[PDB]
Design a protein around this ligand. Structure first.
Ligand SMILES: N=C(C(=O)O)/C(=C\C=C/O)C(=O)O
Ligand SMILES: N=C(C(=O)O)/C(=C\C=C/O)C(=O)O
Ligand SMILES: [Fe+2]
Ligand SMILES: [Fe+2]
Ligand SMILES: [Fe+2]
Ligand SMILES: [Fe+2]
Lengths: 174, 174
């Protein structure tokens, strides 16, 4: 019986201290390692084109600045704003694409470790017809070791970007 | 695919609005119902004598005011302060007794639904010899429907309060 994750510590100060990691190139920072609760602060600017299909819930608390989530709810493209001060609970499998335009912003995001055999999805959809263009499923163990080469190989492949329904080649990075 | 838990909403304002529930007699308020993430704000004043043995992690973010956790770490009685602004990740099964002396305080506490057969513990220890006095295990489904009658029946029973090791009868409520 030990405090495997250390003592309590001041959160605004920790965010301040890691501001240089809460901006490009990265923009993520996991707070504690090897815990069941995956607790992360997400900065900005970042925009992305992928949608996440998380088989478990995600919790958001927009501490500083504003962000928004592009979503598919009920087959329609829908946007949930994370204004500063907002909290939000995302149910499993709602496809979501976080957009974080502001520098200096910071969002508490809490998730759980996925059990073996429970897989995450990353999807791109066609700007033109809305059809699914590409999905990869991954056994997520480390958000920053598993995810870059996924996105990267979608961007690298016109065939992965080619819409099966209208032939439009998804743009890729932006 | 729907936002089963609604849209994002301003958290400081929600805390303000429910301040009358974040004070005795209760002092708890779960944010969303029937979710895997059990997300709750805990107010004050509250003191309590029981220790919780949670088979899963708990996450704390002391948003307003100050609190502390009485703990058993490594067999010794240890205190972790939750100063305002502190966050903290508690590993499974560390016994903890939250003390919340300040009125107006507010602590984000996040836990997961326990699977069937994974049981919570509530323990009292002897002021005089430190030995365990009483433990109840419960299949926790609702923090406010399962817990009061537990504590209440410990307070009601001198035999449950009687230390098996030194005979001292635990004081009960305070
Ligand atoms: N919602 C997520 C996620 O990846 O699951 C996130 C980015 C990474 C860290 O949580 C974000 O930008 O909000
Ligand atoms: N740590 C808990 C818990 O019961 O598990 C809590 C009280 C109730 C709601 O979380 C608290 O006062 O901090
Ligand atoms: Fe996600
Ligand atoms: Fe298309
Ligand atoms: Fe607890
Ligand atoms: Fe005793």
């Amino acid at each position: 019986h030990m405090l495997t994750y250390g003592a309590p510590f001041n959160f605004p100060r920790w965010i301040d201290e890691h501001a240089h990691l809460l901006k490009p190139p990265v923009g993520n920072r996991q707070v504690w390692q090897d815990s069941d609760f995956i607790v992360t602060v997400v900065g900005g600017p970042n925009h992305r084109t992928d949608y996440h299909d998380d088989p478990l819930e995600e919790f958001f608390y927009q501490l500083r600045g504003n962000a928004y989530l592009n979503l598919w709810v009920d087959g329609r493209r829908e946007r949930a704003d994370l204004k500063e001060g907002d909290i939000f609970l995302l149910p499993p499998h709602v496809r979501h694409s976080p957009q974080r335009p502001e520098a200096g912003s910071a969002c508490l995001v809490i998730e759980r470790q996925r059990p073996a055999g429970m897989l995450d999805g990353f999807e791109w959809y066609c700007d033109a017809c809305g059809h699914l263009v590409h999905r990869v499923e991954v056994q997520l163990k480390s958000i920053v070791t598993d995810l870059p080469p996924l996105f990267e190989s979608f961007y690298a492949s016109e065939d992965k970007r080619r819409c099966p329904h209208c032939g439009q080649v998804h743009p890729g990075r932006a």
